[PDB]
Chains A and B, each alone.
Chain A
Amino acid sequence: ESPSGYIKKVILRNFMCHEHFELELGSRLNFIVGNNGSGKSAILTAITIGLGAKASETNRGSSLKDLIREGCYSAKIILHLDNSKYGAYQQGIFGNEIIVERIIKRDGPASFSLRSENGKEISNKKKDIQTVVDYFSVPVSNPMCFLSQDAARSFLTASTSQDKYSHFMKGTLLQEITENLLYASAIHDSAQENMAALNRLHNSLKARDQNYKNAEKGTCFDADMDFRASLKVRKFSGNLSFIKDTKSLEIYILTTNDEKARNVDTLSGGEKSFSQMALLLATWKPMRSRIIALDQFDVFMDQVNRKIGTTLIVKKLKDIARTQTIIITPQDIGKIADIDSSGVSIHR
């Protein structure tokens, strides 16, 4: 079945709008529904904070205390991770699942206790829960995988040619190696002018730009193959081209009624919205995560086209057995696509 590292159950305690919340998710595309201002963002914020997020890592809560609802004294977060298939590290120590406990008090340090199958504490260090999260290939650190309502709105909105390139590069962690290894203009140039073998550092640095250019070809190619395979659900064709000279993401598309592919910014709202949703899906492909979330993909796409976006999401994500999606959307939309097919766990 699906390899280990998917969330079984989530239990809350006196959160922003939930007093005692309990949800159960599946090992695949997992919709949950509601309406505006129903605490839908609360569960995503909790699931981000419960693993690696900090007090000011969301730009919505100023600290680790405003999360507690006014009048309440403390808060508690507890998650369950499956360990049955590949990825069940030292399963004999705990069992077939891993339980973490994040308790935040009104005053004092926050305990990060880690529990076993039967719920007894086995560790409390942040490093232990962090290595557990990063083993199951969880992208907790990343600020894209568990996109917020406004963070995801920053991508799926009015963009230009040299803006989607920035979003894709930042999301794919390709604006980290082009800065951690771009200060060579002073470490190899200005760090040698003292006599006009200490050049061993420049030797390693030249055998490290290969690492970046051989991980920007095989990572920006996997996000381009899954953009031509997602334009085939509207009977379209096309691709997307990276321009390093301009740092641009010009996307070229060709419709059934069209004879020659034109630029995306020449069509109506629907095709542009579909293309940007396809790019949003393509961004996640190269980076091998295990849990992906999203919130409010209905920022500007109409419901008539939001249905098409839903069908796209369902075909692209449901079949994967190694990416547990936790998409959040208010309206119930299990009435158009093949939600009855095994691989969807719509929850309210």
Chain B
Amino acid sequence: GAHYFVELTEKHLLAFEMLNSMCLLENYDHVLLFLECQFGKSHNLAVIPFDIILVLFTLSTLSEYYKEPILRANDPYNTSRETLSRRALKLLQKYLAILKEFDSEQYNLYDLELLRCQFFLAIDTLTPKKQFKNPYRSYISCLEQRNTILGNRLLNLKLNEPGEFINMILWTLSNSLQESTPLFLSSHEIWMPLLEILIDLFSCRQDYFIQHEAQNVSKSLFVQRLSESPLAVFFESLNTRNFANRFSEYVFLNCDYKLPSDNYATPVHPVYNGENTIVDTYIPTIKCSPLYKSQKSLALRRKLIGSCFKLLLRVPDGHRLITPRIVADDVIQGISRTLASFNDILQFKKFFMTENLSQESYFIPLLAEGTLSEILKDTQVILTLVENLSDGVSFCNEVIGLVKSKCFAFTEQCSQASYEEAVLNIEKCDVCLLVLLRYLLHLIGAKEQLEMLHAIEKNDSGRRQWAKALNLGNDPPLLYPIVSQMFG
């Protein structure tokens, strides 16, 4: 009963000791069938025990693409027409969309507070190192004498190994943009939706640890209650003191921007053996386009930084965080000197043009302006756009000042010698402006807009005539046709 601990009513104890008995008999089909048969039926919320989470965290990391025989020698009938790893994942993502609602209008608050206890007990076992204790007493559980599940050891028992919660992050990030099926599948249905759960839970334990830690405490010590925070040990796994040049290259591992890291790339190895091997009796069917590959791998690289500008946002203006030893300004010019360095501009758009615009606020209109300020240092300044993101008149006046400052028109007479890089550079500084414009249009719900309109008309026409004088067979990367249709 240290904190968030909820005791067991006898009507939940039965389902607690029954699921563990079923799981002890190597019978996971019925363990899963226990939860699914009573999911959307009534207002009961049959919660998973906290040790039947570390089982679904290990039933998830064994997909048929490399363990087809073992998934068949367990239940050779396959009643549900699904595997053990595609239903475990479908439960963890179904009992998580319930946790982050806390809707008491249908469930009972006791079940919703018990489920949170199970989830936090589960995610309080993942303690990353660098290189069993059941809190209840009513029942004896599994995971006391059982170590491995179908060969795969465990998740809590493996991520705690020295230098392993850092290798699996680089595993799911580097093999994100891969072409070989044995490698791309190891991070599309095994480690990509599993890190999206770990990050979404480590970022919900933080939402609780802040309130129910010490109200009315000194600011100098409130920052000391963020060094033992759950989001602090998570980012403590990064075993370097160069977050200005290490967190900017761990998020973008397999991306190809202008990689200047003279140090050798991080050694990436599989978590469980046989992961980078497809099996003979399974042939893939889903065709993943290279654009689709680099759309769901940049919605995770951004989601992994979006949990770093939520830990750093809580640092008070006076002091700085102790355990990670990082600054909320050394990682806005670090995720901007590489974002402004991308070669494939279809990855740049996939990163900035996000499908979750409202939740992923508070840090995107910081890298967007932070990146536009990194490009104009070569195109030829002080950017105050985010401070003017609330009042449109000031943001306008600034953008007309910028376009009059000749930072959106092309460079000097050098046209064809270095066109291939100049066009990419000048168009990469247009997405940031477009992203900021979209945010303003969403954060604000007159004549200055029209003045920006005609100014951008003259600028675009200047680029157009410059490209015409470039004896070039195609159009320049115009701006206008986007802003015109955005405004209306």
CA distance A117 to B30 in the complex (A): 47
* B144 neighbours in A (Cβ, 8 Å): 252, 261
* B22 neighbours in A (Cβ, 8 Å): 221
CB of A37, distance to nearest CB on chain B (Å): 43
* B77 neighbours in A (Cβ, 8 Å): 210
Q: Does A237 make an interface contact (CB < 8 A)?
A: yes
> How many residues of B are counted as interface, with CB atoms below 8 angstroms from the partner's CB atoms?
16
For residues 246 through 275 of chain A, which have their beta carbon under 8 Å from a beta carbon of chain B? 252-254, 261
CB of A207, distance to nearest CB on chain B (Å): 10
CA distance A242 to B146 in the complex (A): 13
Q: Does A228 make an interface contact (CB < 8 A)?
A: yes
B137 & A241 in contact (Cβ 8 Å cutoff): no
A228 & B139 in contact (Cβ 8 Å cutoff): yes
* A217 neighbours in B (Cβ, 8 Å): 25, 27, 30
Q: Does B267 make an interface contact (CB < 8 A)?
A: no
B140 & A220 in contact (Cβ 8 Å cutoff): no
Q: Does A239 make an interface contact (CB < 8 A)?
A: yes
Q: Does B399 make an interface contact (CB < 8 A)?
A: no
B17 & A221 in contact (Cβ 8 Å cutoff): no
Which of these, A221, A225, A238, contacts B140 with CB under 8 Å? A238
Chain B, residues 23-54, CB within 8 Å of chain A (1/0): the string is 01101001000000000000000000000000
B138 & A237 in contact (Cβ 8 Å cutoff): yes
* B21 neighbours in A (Cβ, 8 Å): 221, 224-225, 228, 239
* B140 neighbours in A (Cβ, 8 Å): 228, 237-239, 252-254, 261
Closest to A220 in B: B25
* A220 neighbours in B (Cβ, 8 Å): 25
> How many residues of A are counted as interface, with CB atoms below 8 angstroms from the partner's CB atoms?
17
For residues 316 through 343 of chain B, which have their beta carbon under 8 Å from a beta carbon of chain A? none
* A225 neighbours in B (Cβ, 8 Å): 17-18, 21
Q: Does B145 make an interface contact (CB < 8 A)?
A: yes
CB of B401, distance to nearest CB on chain A (Å): 71
Which of these, B17, B25, B30, contacts A228 with CB under 8 Å? B17
* B76 neighbours in A (Cβ, 8 Å): 210
Which of these, B18, B25, B139, B145, contacts A237 with CB under 8 Å? B139
Which of these, A221, A254, A261, contacts B25 with CB under 8 Å? A221
CB of B38, distance to nearest CB on chain A (Å): 18
Chain A, residues 210-227, CB within 8 Å of chain B (1/0): the string is 100000011011001100
A239 & B138 in contact (Cβ 8 Å cutoff): no
Closest to B29 in A: A217
CA distance A252 to B27 in the complex (A): 20
CB of B175, distance to nearest CB on chain A (Å): 36
* B18 neighbours in A (Cβ, 8 Å): 225
A237 & B137 in contact (Cβ 8 Å cutoff): yes
* A239 neighbours in B (Cβ, 8 Å): 21, 24, 139-140
CA distance A241 to B22 in the complex (A): 11
Chain A, residues 276-304, CB within 8 Å of chain B (1/0): the string is 00000000000000000000000000000
CA distance A210 to B75 in the complex (A): 9
* A210 neighbours in B (Cβ, 8 Å): 76-77
* A241 neighbours in B (Cβ, 8 Å): 24, 145
* B27 neighbours in A (Cβ, 8 Å): 217, 221
* B139 neighbours in A (Cβ, 8 Å): 228, 237, 239
For residues 135 through 150 of chain B, which have their beta carbon under 8 Å from a beta carbon of chain A? 137-140, 144-145
Closest to B146 in A: A241
CA distance A232 to B18 in the complex (A): 15
Closest to B136 in A: A237
CA distance A47 to B390 in the complex (A): 92
Given contacts A210-B77, A254-B140, contact A242 B25 (CB under 8 A): yes
* A228 neighbours in B (Cβ, 8 Å): 17, 21, 139-140
CA distance A335 to B159 in the complex (A): 58
* A242 neighbours in B (Cβ, 8 Å): 25
Could you say which of A228, A238, A252 has the most chain B C-beta atoms within 10 Å of its C-beta?
A: A228
Closest to A232 in B: B138
* A237 neighbours in B (Cβ, 8 Å): 137-140
CB of B218, distance to nearest CB on chain A (Å): 39
CB of B260, distance to nearest CB on chain A (Å): 54
Closest to A244 in B: B26
* A254 neighbours in B (Cβ, 8 Å): 137, 140
12 contacts between A and B (CB under 8 A): A210-B77, A217-B25, A221-B21, A224-B25, A225-B17, A225-B18, A225-B21, A228-B17, A237-B137, A241-B145, A252-B144, A254-B140
Q: What 19 new A-B contacts, CB under 8 Å, besides A228-B139, A228-B140, A237-B138?
A: A210-B77, A220-B25, A221-B21, A221-B22, A221-B27, A225-B17, A225-B21, A228-B21, A237-B137, A237-B139, A238-B140, A239-B24, A239-B139, A252-B140, A252-B145, A253-B140, A254-B137, A261-B140, A261-B144
Residues of A in contact with B (beta carbons under 8 Å apart): 210, 217-218, 220-221, 224-225, 228, 237-239, 241-242, 252-254, 261
5 closest A-B pairs by beta carbon, nearest first, are: A217-B27, A238-B140, A239-B140, A261-B140, A224-B21
